[PDB]
């Protein structure tokens, strides 16, 4: 009643506060600040449940509705680009503050066990939370064409502006916020369409609510509204040459999620559109060149896990892995970025191209891999180097297994002596060399993160052995002794360019039963002994399945009213021991399967070597006896 009905006065005041930019931005900031709870950034949604109960209003929805209507329609009356950028940034921040304040796991567990197991008392609380929280309205607005059009217009800008702009420029911050909102929407679209739409529809059908739809029924998902924009990927790729770590990581994650989808790649390749869009003015070439220049940039030894360069490298590697693992038979953008001529159900190399001159992304990866040393002195056997090489080897294996990109890759590898570089980069493992300053025999080893690096190193050795065996089989079937001599010399322990290297029998040091990975010390467990891991269990024992059971048991014991305060610490320490027991069992299973895979790879390599061997046997009798001596204790 601002001094005329309230439904009219409120909209009149909102429209009055919409004229201009200063007052609009100030109101948006005020609303964003008010939406923050007093405890800071989970229940008790930050607003009174009786907000607007007197008048026939939907609560706090009108505010978000007006904000979205403004951001969608009145963005053309702003001449000053700075004001428009500030308004878009404020709207994106408001949307993010509204989305981040939504419970996902809570609603999932509710819809799962509340009505099916728990009573019907708390159901009303979750219902009111889902009905009053503005997340549903934001998601509904996200399916509008105006919103995505404004977003892609804001993200589509000239490169000169971003180049001459400052890292703290509002344009970069707005683009980052928009990418984050898009990521959150792509993550929560399924949860929404599953546990919001039906409940809201049922409530609207039962009770009396007057709401105006703002979503498009045709857009069954968020990808339907964005699959019509081809310049988005081009802009995301061009924005990688700016140097901004956060923006680069966001763009890489967005491209990875896009390549991971299915409808987008079904619409693109039902000839194709992306390959021709990225080959308009040589965008792929410059993108590959920028990626190569980036991965070649060194890292900061002190800021191992904080070096933005290493983070960008890992993001690019994850993107390539996800793009190659998805739909390997049909080519993708990864093949074009590597320097291949992506043709319909066929690949090829062009003359004088970047991949022909051995200057491309794949060759850059090969170089940075062969010029990488993991053997250190101060710590020795670092972890992040191991992770990097493991990712590189996974990408190489994904490229090799694909028969569409196997022959050319094997040719390019054998034409540069990659196996020789790998062997020269090999390092022997012993129980004395610690992992990141920590010894293996220590009990904390199974609890520390060194297990991941150990599994990665085992997988790397297995992949190297498999590649060596495949190359040996190829050279044998090709009936050419020009390379067989060098292969045997490398296996004999000599190199003629003589440089010596440890033989294959030297690397047979990963089979050791002294650690007793199978045996586990079982504590007394005077209580909770009957709690098994039935619902916990692909050997993967979930911890929540036992956490809920032990919590229910503790609640029952407390309700029994028999020395509940004293014996609580016993149950607490038993749970703290059981969680580490489960983690140790999982790590032991992982180590066991890794050792099994490595042993299988080594056995296959040895079989391929023994079978395809025309060299005399009397000289190799020494190696035969050595292998027999080495396997004797293993069999025993």
């Amino acid at each position: 009643n601002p001094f005329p009905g309230p439904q009219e006065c409120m909209e009149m005041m909102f429209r009055e506060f919409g004229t201009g930019f200063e007052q609009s931005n100030a109101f948006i900031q005020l609303l964003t600040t008010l939406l923050v709870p007093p405890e800071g950034l989970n229940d008790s949604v930050p607003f009174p449940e009786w907000l607007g109960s007197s008048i026939r209003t939907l609560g706090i929805e009108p505010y978000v509705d007006f904000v979205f209507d403004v951001f969608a329609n009145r963005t053309k009356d702003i001449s000053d680009p700075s004001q428009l950028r500030i308004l878009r940034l404020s709207c994106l921040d408001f949307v993010m503050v509204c989305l981040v304040t939504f419970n996902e796991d809570l609603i999932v567990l509710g819809h799962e066990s509340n009505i099916s197991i728990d009573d019907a008392m708390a159901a009303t609380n979750l219902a009111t939370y889902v009905r009053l929280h503005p997340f549903s309205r934001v998601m509904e607005w996200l399916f509008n064409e105006k919103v995505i059009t404004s977003l892609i217009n804001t993200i589509h800008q000239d490169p000169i502006s971003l180049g001459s702009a400052s890292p703290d420029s509002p344009l970069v911050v707005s683009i980052l916020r928009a990418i984050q909102v898009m990521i959150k929407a792509l993550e929560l679209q399924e949860t929404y369409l599953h546990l919001v739409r039906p409940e809201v529809l049922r409530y609207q059908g039962e009770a009396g609510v007057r709401r105006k739809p703002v979503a498009n029924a045709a857009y069954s998902a968020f990808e339907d509204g964005i699959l019509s924009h081809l310049s988005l990927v081009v802009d995301l790729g061009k924005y990688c040459n700016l140097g901004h770590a956060e923006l680069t990581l966001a763009c890489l994650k967005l491209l990875e999620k896009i390549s991971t989808s299915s409808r987008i790649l079904s619409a693109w390749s039902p000839r194709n559109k992306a390959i021709v869009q990225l080959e308009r003015n040589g965008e792929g070439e410059t993108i590959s060149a920028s990626l190569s220049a980036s991965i070649m940039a060194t890292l900061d030894p002190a800021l191992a896990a904080s070096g933005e360069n290493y983070r960008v490298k890992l993001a690019i590697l994850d993107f390539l892995y996800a793009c190659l693992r998805a739909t390997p038979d049909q080519p993708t953008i990864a093949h074009q970025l590597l320097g291949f001529h992506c043709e319909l159900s066929k690949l090829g190399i062009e003359p004088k191209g970047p991949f022909d001159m051995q200057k491309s992304l794949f060759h850059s990866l090969l170089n940075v891999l062969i010029t990488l040393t993991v053997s250190e002195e101060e710590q020795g056997m670092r972890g992040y180097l191991v992770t990097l090489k493991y990712r590189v080897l996974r990408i190489l294996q994904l490229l090799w297994k694909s028969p569409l990109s196997a022959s050319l890759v094997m040719d390019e590898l054998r034409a540069t002596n990659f196996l020789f570089h790998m062997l020269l980069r090999e390092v022997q493992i012993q129980p004395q060399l610690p992992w990141d300053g920590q010894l293996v025999t220590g009990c904390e080893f199974l609890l520390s993160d060194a297990s991941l690096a150990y599994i990665d190193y085992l997988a790397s050795r297995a992949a190297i052995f498999e590649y060596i065996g495949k190359e040996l089989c190829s050279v044998s079937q090709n009936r050419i002794p020009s390379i067989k001599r060098q292969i045997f010399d490398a296996l004999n322990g000599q190199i003629f360019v003589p440089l010596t290297i440890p033989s294959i029998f030297d690397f047979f040091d990963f089979i050791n039963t002294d650690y007793k990975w199978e045996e586990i010390p079982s504590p007394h467990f005077t209580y909770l002994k009957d709690l098994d891991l039935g619902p916990c269990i692909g050997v993967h024992y979930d911890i929540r399945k036992a956490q809920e059971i032990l919590a229910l048991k503790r609640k029952e014991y407390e309700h029994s009213q028999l020395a509940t305060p004293e014996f609580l610490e016993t149950v607490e320490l038993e749970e703290k021991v059981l969680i580490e027991w489960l983690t140790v069992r999982n790590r032991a299973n992982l180590l066991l399967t890794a050792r099994l895979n490595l042993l299988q790879a080594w056995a296959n390599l040895l079989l391929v070597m023994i079978e395809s061997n025309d060299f005399k046997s009397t000289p190799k009798m020494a190696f035969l006896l050595q292998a027999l001596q080495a396997i004797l204790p293993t069999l025993e």
């Binding site: 051995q358 002596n417 360019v497």
Partner: peptide, 9 residues
């Protein structure tokens, strides 16, 4: 063609 890929330590 192989400026640095050579095995010349």
């Amino acid at each position: 063609i192989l400026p640095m890929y050579k095995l010349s330590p």
